[PDB]
DNA sequence: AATAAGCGGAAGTGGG
DNA sequence: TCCCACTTCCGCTTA
């Protein structure tokens, strides 16, 4: 099954949830979630994964924080903003 | 207070 | 056995 960072990168490339997520600086790999429309994107992640419970942004962001140590995604000190690593972007 | 983003320890689930 | 890659739950902090 697809990994969360790849799910997000695929959405950003396809543009299918443009009102929920967007690039801030695609060259740097920085992206930002919609304050009002992030939950619809979280819901789609959980359904794609076939999880038992409804997915929420809180739980999705709990998973995102676990990438901080390995580096695929880092939190940026801006509201709802994160950054993919160069390695993730290159693939 | 009400709302919201952010945090992470701990334990549970999946598929190796 | 025991790690993967999250998921779920809970309590806390800051604005
Ligand atoms: Na967040
Ligand atoms: Na929030």
């Amino acid at each position: 099954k697809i990994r969360l960072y790849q799910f997000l990168l695929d959405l950003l490339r396809s543009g299918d949830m443009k009102d929920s997520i967007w690039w801030v600086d695609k060259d740097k790999g920085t992206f930002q979630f919609s304050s009002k429309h992030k939950e619809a994107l979280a819901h789609r992640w959980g359904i794609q994964k076939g999880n038992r419970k409804k997915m929420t942004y809180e739980k999705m962001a709990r998973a995102l924080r676990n990438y901080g140590k390995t580096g695929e995604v880092k939190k940026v000190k801006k509201k709802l903003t994160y950054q993919f690593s160069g390695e993730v972007l290159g693939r």
Side-chain angles (χ1 to χ4, degrees), chain A residues 35-75:
Chain A
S35 176
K36 277 278 287 185
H37 305 298
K38 62 196 187 295
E39 294 296 343
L41 179 158
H43 292 343
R44 173 176 178 164
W45 170 235
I47 287 167
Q48 185 164 132
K49 282 290 299 292
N51 295 331
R52 173 180 52 244
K53 309 274 178 175
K54 180 189 83 184
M55 175 59 59
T56 64
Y57 180 80
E58 159 105 294
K59 287 188 289 186
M60 194 184 69
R62 181 71 187 79
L64 284 180
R65 287 193 294 283
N66 288 336
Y67 290 131
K69 205 171 176 301
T70 50
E72 291 92 340
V73 183
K74 292 193 164 186
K75 187 76 177 63

